[PDB]
Symmetry: D2
Subunit: 115 residues, 4 copies
């Protein structure tokens, strides 16, 4: 599993469950092409997005659908979504976890890149 996403809710102190996540890869015409997507599990994680064979070097974008997540909790959010854009590199460590911590008007995202 080369690319995993983990999302937390800073308001409830809990995983952010059932959050839609869409990943895109930049194509040679500079557009974003759908690459992988899913919904975070009960532990706030999304696994099984891609495989080592398919996850080649390139520029990827991970879009986390935060606004629908907050609307379903009845809390007015600021952002349309949270967006993480990065270059995957074979010289780096082999596994990428994109973590995100969500509040209605604020989020952080951290990449944890390991062996």
């Amino acid at each position: 599993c080369p690319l995993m996403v983990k999302v937390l809710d800073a308001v409830r102190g809990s995983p952010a469950i059932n959050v839609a996540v869409h990943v895109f890869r930049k194509a040679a015409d500079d557009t974003w092409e759908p690459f992988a997507s899913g919904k975070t599990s009960e532990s706030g994680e999304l696994h099984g997005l891609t495989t080592e064979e398919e996850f080649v070097e390139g520029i990827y974008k991970v879009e986390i659908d935060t606004k629908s997540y907050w609307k379903a909790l009845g809390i007015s959010p600021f952002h349309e979504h949270a967006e993480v854009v990065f270059t995957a590199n074979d010289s780096g460590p082999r596994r990428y976890t994109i973590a995100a911590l969500l509040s209605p008007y604020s989020y952080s995202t951290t990449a944890v890149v390991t062996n």
Copy 2:
């Protein structure tokens, strides 16, 4: 001043100076149209991007060029840029401060929105 951007460096504990920032507005046709751009100052702030008149309702995207920033300090960072995407002015004009706090493999962004 309805839209301002403030950027901090979490490594040095200082403003992030000379950070390029590009703002786009989602078009009628669904594309991102260029809306305004500038660089942060010595205080890590970017003012004067737009006017209440020009800054109408819409979906806006504030792209902060964090990669050039880290690279010019000798660091190879994770993200290409930070992107902040939000609907603005849909309940009337507001003043928006988009803050970002940067580290090489992490950032956070916070909006402070006040009723002018």
Copy 3:
């Protein structure tokens, strides 16, 4: 103004107003001695805590009363308070801004330190 505190509410996207803040300085004897205190204003800022003269080298602790804050808005938060502990002025006088960004079960704190 060598020491200032700024507090934001990540839920509402606004300054956190009326947040009580207590500052302590580590004593000669190792205890935390009361150093200064105040409440954030309408802009979520606390100024005038100390003076360059009084603010000497030492280890300081800035305690931000985040629990009273959330509770007065009907939220039962995780933390009793946020505590920020740092050595100050050990390479000469500096100006310190202690920023905090609050959510019910999370906060972050950032120092911006500049050479006056």
Copy 4:
């Protein structure tokens, strides 16, 4: 395992390994008494701090020794340590993860409290 700590390094994009963590419980004379301590593992985690029997309701403080961690990387830090202070409650969910994300001049901490 009722209380776990997980620490990440925002500068290197990695778990924060070998970070000392000390936990204290507030005693009836208002002092902090040592309760549990350890060093984060290679995955940035610390487990086995306490047991459900011993972790009773009370006010606890978790001190994460960030300053020594940054000094060992040769990076000048701001804080002496990061401190998380909270009341454990039996009405809450039964497991507490104190997560912390560290930079030299900034840190965040989040409690993820689950079943």
